[PDB]
Each structure stands twice: as C-alpha cells, then as structure tokens.
Amino acid sequence: FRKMAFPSGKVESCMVQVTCGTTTLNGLWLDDVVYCPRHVICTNTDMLNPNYEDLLIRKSNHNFLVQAGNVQLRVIGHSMQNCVLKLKVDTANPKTPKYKFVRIQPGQTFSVLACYNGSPSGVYQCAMRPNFTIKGSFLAGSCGSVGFNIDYDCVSFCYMHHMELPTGVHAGTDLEGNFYGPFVDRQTAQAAGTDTTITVNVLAWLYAAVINGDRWFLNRFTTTLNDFNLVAMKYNYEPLTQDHVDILGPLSAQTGIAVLDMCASLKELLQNGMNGRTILGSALLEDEFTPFDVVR
Amino acid sequence: FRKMAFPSGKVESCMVQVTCGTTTLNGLWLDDVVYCPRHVICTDMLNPNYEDLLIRKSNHNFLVQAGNVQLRVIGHSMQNCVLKLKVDTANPKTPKYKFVRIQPGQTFSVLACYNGSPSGVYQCAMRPNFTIKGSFLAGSCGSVGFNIDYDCVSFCYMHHMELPTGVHAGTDLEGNFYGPFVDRQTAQAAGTDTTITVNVLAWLYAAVINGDRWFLNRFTTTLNDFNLVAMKYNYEPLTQDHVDILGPLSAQTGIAVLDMCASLKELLQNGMNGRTILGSALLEDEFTPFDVVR
Numbered sequence: 001f002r003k004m005a006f007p008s009g010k011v012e013s014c015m016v017q018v019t020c021g022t023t024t025l026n027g028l029w030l031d032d033v034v035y036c037p038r039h040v041i042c043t044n045t046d047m048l049n050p051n052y053e054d055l056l057i058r059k060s061n062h063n064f065l066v067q068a069g070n071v072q073l074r075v076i077g078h079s080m081q082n083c084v085l086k087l088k089v090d091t092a093n094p095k096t097p098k099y100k101f102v103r104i105q106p107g108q109t110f111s112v113l114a115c116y117n118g119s120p121s122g123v124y125q126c127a128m129r130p131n132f133t134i135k136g137s138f139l140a141g142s143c144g145s146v147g148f149n150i151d152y153d154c155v156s157f158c159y160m161h162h163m164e165l166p167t168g169v170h171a172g173t174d175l176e177g178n179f180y181g182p183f184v185d186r187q188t189a190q191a192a193g194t195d196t197t198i199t200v201n202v203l204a205w206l207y208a209a210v211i212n213g214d215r216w217f218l219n220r221f222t223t224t225l226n227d228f229n230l231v232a233m234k235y236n237y238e239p240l241t242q243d244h245v246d247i248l249g250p251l252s253a254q255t256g257i258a259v260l261d262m263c264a265s266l267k268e269l270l271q272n273g274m275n276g277r278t279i280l281g282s283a284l285l286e287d288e289f290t291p292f293d294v295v296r
Numbered sequence: 297f298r299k300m301a302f303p304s305g306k307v308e309s310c311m312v313q314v315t316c317g318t319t320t321l322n323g324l325w326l327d328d329v330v331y332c333p334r335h336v337i338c339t340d341m342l343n344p345n346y347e348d349l350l351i352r353k354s355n356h357n358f359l360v361q362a363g364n365v366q367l368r369v370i371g372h373s374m375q376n377c378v379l380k381l382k383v384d385t386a387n388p389k390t391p392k393y394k395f396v397r398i399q400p401g402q403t404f405s406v407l408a409c410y411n412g413s414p415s416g417v418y419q420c421a422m423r424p425n426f427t428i429k430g431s432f433l434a435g436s437c438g439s440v441g442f443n444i445d446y447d448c449v450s451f452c453y454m455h456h457m458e459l460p461t462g463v464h465a466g467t468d469l470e471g472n473f474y475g476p477f478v479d480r481q482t483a484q485a486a487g488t489d490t491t492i493t494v495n496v497l498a499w500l501y502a503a504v505i506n507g508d509r510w511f512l513n514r515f516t517t518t519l520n521d522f523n524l525v526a527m528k529y530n531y532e533p534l535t536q537d538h539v540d541i542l543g544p545l546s547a548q549t550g551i552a553v554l555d556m557c558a559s560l561k562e563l564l565q566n567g568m569n570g571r572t573i574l575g576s577a578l579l580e581d582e583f584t585p586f587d588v589v590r
C-alpha cells in the first residue's frame with residue numbers, strides 16, 4: 001500500500017504560464033479560457049489590502065502574457081469570478097479533456113500537479129484537512145497549480161493553489177474562485193484553525209492494513225458510536241458520523257471486521273499506542289486515504 | 297515535504313496492452329517497438345525454455361492494442377528477459393527517452409498500469425537488495441519506472457513479478473534483472489534488506505533546510521566509527537562516494553557530513569521521543585540527495 005496519484009497527462013496538457021507585470025504563475029487552459037489566481041494582478045503595494053475590482057478595471061488585455069510552452073496565447077478578454085481570474089484567449093486548447101469543476105469536502109483526497117513557469121514539475125496525493133488546509137509541497141511560483149480527481153476519462157478539478165500559511169500548510173480555492181477555509185487573498189496575518197484527524201480515513205486505512213496482512217491490532221471487542229466519539233473528542237479526532245459508518249460498509253463485509261469492532265481496535269490504538277509496532281509501514285495512524293482510495 | 301512523482305503524461309502515451317494466449321499484460325511502445333516481459337509467452341512457469349517457447353510463435357500470436365487501435369506485429373525478438381515486438385506503426389507520441397540501469401538507493405516514479413491503461417503514479421526506490429517496495433496487482437507486469445529530466449524520460453525499470461515477501465522484482469529496459477532473480481516461479485528470496493544511509497542523511501539535511509534542528513548535537517564521528525554503529529541497526533555502510541555526494545547539501549546548511557552522521561547515530565540511539573521530522577515518525581530513506589535538492 002502506497003499513496004498513489006492519478007495519472008496526470010490529461011492535466012499536464014492544460015497548464016500554461018501567466019505573467020502580469022512582475023509576477024509569474026501558472027494558469028489552467030480549458031477551451032478558450034485560462035484560469036489563474038486573481039492575486040496575479042497585485043504588486044507589492046497592493047498586496048496588503050487590494051481592491052481587486054479597481055486593480056482589474058485598470059488592466060487591459062495586453063497586461064497578461066500567457067504562454068503555452070513556446071506559444072504565446074493572445075488574451076482577448078479578462079474577467080474575475082470570486083478569487084480567480086478568467087482570461088479569454090485567442091485559441092481553444094485542442095487537448096481540453098472532458099472536465100468538471102467540483103467543490104470537495106474536508107477529508108476527501110485529490111492529486112496535485114505542482115507546476116512552475118507553466119511547466120508541470122511533480123504530482124502527489126493530498127487530502128483536504130478538516131481545517132480546510134492542504135499539507136502540500138509548494139515553492140515560490142507554484143500558484144495556479146491545480147488539484148483534481150479522474151473518473152473514467154472525466155477530470156474533476158477541485159483545487160487551485162493561492163497561498164502558504166505561516167505554519168507551512170497551504171490554502172486555495174475551488175475553480176470557481178471560492179476559498180476553502182476562512183482565508184482571504186490579502187497579505188495579512190492568517191492562521192489555520194486547530195486541525196483534527198479524519199477518523200473515517202484512519203478506519204479505511206486500518207481496513208487496508210487487514211487486507212494486506214497486518215492484523216495485530218484486531219481484538220475481540222466492539223464499542224458504541226457514543227463511547228468511541230467521546231474518545232475521538234479526547235484525541236482531536238473528527239466525530240464518526242452514522243453516515244461515515246455506512247460508507248465503510250464494503251470494507252467491513254470483505255474483511256468481516258465491523259466498523260464498531262474496528263473502532264474498538266482504533267480506540268485502544270489511541271492509548272496503548274502501537275507498543276513499538278508498525279501498521280502498514282507507519283509509526284503513525286494515517287488519515288489521508290479515503291474508503292474509495294483503499295478499494296481502488 | 298512530499299514523496300513527489302514525475303508527471304506521467306509522457307509515459308502514459310506509450311502504454312499498450314499485449315496479449316499472448318491467455319495472458320494479458322502491459323507493453324511500452326516507443327517508435328515501432330513494443331517492449332514487454334518475455335514471460336507473456338508462458339503457459340511452463342517453473343522451468344521455461346524461452347528460446348523454445350518463442351520459436352513456436354508467429355507474429356499474429358501477439359495481440360497489441362493501443363487504446364482502441366490494434367497494432368499489427370511484424371516481427372519479434374528476445375533481448376535478455378524482455379520481448380521486443382516490432383509493430384507496423386511508430387508511436388507518434390514517442391518522447392525523448394533513454395534506457396538507464398540504476399543502482400540501489402536510486403529513486404524513480406512508477407506508472408502502475410492494467411490492460412494497457414494507466415492506473416496511478418507513485419515514487420519508489422531500488423532497495424539495497426535489488427527489490428522494490430511497489431504496489432502491483434495481477435496484470436501489472438510491463439508497468440515501467442522512470443525519471444524525467446529536461447523532457448527526456450529515462451526508463452529504468454519494467455515490472456515482472458512479486459516475491460513471497462510482497463516486494464517486487466523486475467528488469468531494466470534491456471531485460472537484465474535487478475538482483476539475483478530470474479523469470480521462473482521457483483523458490484527465490486530477496487536477501488536481507490538494509491536502510492539506505494545516504495538517503496536518510498540527505499533527508500535530515502532537507503529537515504535542516506526547512507525548519508528543524510532539534511536532532512543535531514555537539515558531537516562528530518569518524519566515518520569508520522559511524523559505520524560500525526550504523527551497521528548494528530541494519531544500515532547500509534556509508535562510503536566516501538556517499539560523503540562526496542552529500543558535499544553540496546553540507547555546504548548549503550553549514551553542517552559537516554560527519555556531524556550529520558553524529559546526529560543520525562544519536563537518533564538511532566534515542567528515537568525521536570514523540571517528535572516528527574519533516575512529516576514522519578521514522579527515518580525516511582527513499583529520498584536521494586538529488587531528490588532533496590529538487
């Protein structure tokens with residue numbers, strides 16, 4: 001069991017470089033529109049309290065240099081949607097995949113294609129934390145990189161990168177420019193909320209462990225949802241909702257370990273620790289695989 | 297800090313499906329050649345005579361499909377443990393590529409594929425015992441490992457089999473196995489593995505370059521004394537080449553290699569006492585000095 005990213009070729013073909021004055025970052029080219037963070041129109045002067053409408057009315061089409069590899073794309077229109085800028089260009093991307101813009105929920109995973117200067121550099125799997133940040137790996141110029149899932153030839157874009165918080169975790173928007181989490185595109189003091197562990201993902205990961213031959217943590221017991229939730233609250237774990245139990249249904253049946261039976265295992269893991277042992281290859285309870293991620 | 301794979305698009309455009317008899321696996325289509333594991337021609341698995349198995353095949357016994365398109369095989373030959381199927385059509389999306397043979401400790405991306413269609417991408421390392429700790433299911437054979445550098449894809453691994461311990465064995469793209477393995481279903485066992493010491497040190501440098509110094513100390517060590525200690529924890533010996541390779545990261549952080557060796561010695565002695573390094577509760581050994589810089 002390894003953390004696995006989706007194959008990224010369909011998205012690589014959509015990445016372009018956007019330059020506005022002094023700032024260069026990445027854009028997502030789909031049909032005849034390039035999408036990118038609206039903060040690309042900020043200078044050092046504006047970054048602390050921008051008036052994005054004002055700054056945008058100032059700009060004209062030729063203020064944006066869009067580069068698809070060696071080819072410059074001519075901007076013929078510009079617009080803002082929430083915190084994303086939409087640059088209408090000369091030419092529709094001839095490799096636009098089947099795609100959707102989707103908004104994901106905390107606890108869900110996606111692949112990140114990290115890009116610099118419009119050129120894809122690396123790909124890795126992320127989870128939307130319960131505090132709406134991303135534990136990413138993003139350097140200067142990574143803004144505009146996207147997160148996505150693929151479902152049978154259809155790419156669902158869910159994330160575009162905007163910022164790094166002082167703790168080193170990351171914040172961005174969906175592709176309609178709506179931020180994940182209580183963050184703003186302003187150079188002001190911002191902090192992530194206290195994070196919590198994604199309980200249903202930990203359980204799915206334990207089921208993944210049983211499937212792969214590590215069963216030392218299983219026991220004979222079972223808990224209640226109410227009793228397990230008091231434990232989860234003590235250890236900063238997301239409450240296990242009744243719907244969470246249902247999505248684990250397939251894994252309980254394949255292994256014969258009922259969810260509250262596996263919760264009894266997790267309950268004890270939260271106190272005995274691992275007693276010097278390892279679960280999959282990890283000395284920590286891993287919470288960035290969804291039930292779907294384990295089954296696939 | 298993440299285990300990052302290379303973008304897989306250039307390799308996705310090369311994956312095809314090869315069927316021989318009742319067996320389907322993946323092939324790598326570059327120009328007018330499809331490369332795949334020669335054991336696609338087995339029915340036979342304990343003591344195959346591949347020379348005899350192959351002379352009985354004709355071109356039409358190999359069904360090659362690139363997506364919906366069937367590729368006509370016009371010839372075939374065997375190069376060590378890989379089959380080279382000459383096809384009627386050159387891959388129009390062949391990238392700039394090379395075939396490279398890697399040494400233990402080297403990392404690469406794996407594009408896991410099934411029925412010629414890519415399924416996922418992840419980072420991997422060649423273990424000191426010439427296995428890889430992959431994630432491969434039935435039908436993954438022919439999946440390839442690669443690095444990409446300046447739009448040039450360097451293919452270094454093709455998947456052949458799973459050992460009884462659950463680790464994986466395969467060949468370079470000229471069909472020479474990594475390690476003492478053969479394409480037979482006989483009893484073969486990965487030798488005892490070790491931790492890639494040079495990679496653990498690179499990663500501790502990465503920890504320093506980011507924010508963390510809590511594991512440093514005031515000691516140094518000789519290279520010989522470090523190796524005498526580290527081998528008691530099943531670490532690979534550190535060589536002068538490894539010390540040289542770490543020079544750039546040493547000079548960038550101000551921490552002499554042997555001073556970082558002293559810190560590693562103490563980390564092995566003490567554990568991390570409830571802390572993490574980068575993101576991990578264990579000493580990570582699948583990042584190379586090169587991976588850290590990039």
Ligand SMILES: *C(=O)[C@H](C[C@@H]1CCNC1=O)NC(=O)[C@H](CC1CCCCC1)NC(=O)c1cc2ccccc2[nH]1
Nearest residue numbers: 039047138139140141142143162163164166185186187
């Ligand atoms: C876009 O490419 C970068 C990506 C950052 C750079 C470093 N690591 C990343 O992920 N985005 C930024 O640099 C933003 C730009 C701002 C423009 C105006 C609106 C808000 C975003 N800045 C930051 O991410 C930033 C500034 C800052 C200051 C002090 C501590 C942390 C910190 N992070």
Ligand SMILES: *C(=O)[C@H](C[C@@H]1CCNC1=O)NC(=O)[C@H](CC1CCCCC1)NC(=O)c1cc2ccccc2[nH]1
Nearest residue numbers: 335432433434435436437456457458459460479480481
């Ligand atoms: C190719 O697709 C598969 C990949 C395997 C399947 C499961 N996980 C993998 O990586 N390759 C095989 O199944 C090989 C078949 C050839 C191997 C040698 C030459 C002829 C056939 N077999 C194994 O990987 C295998 C069989 C086996 C039996 C008992 C213990 C371990 C074991 N591994």
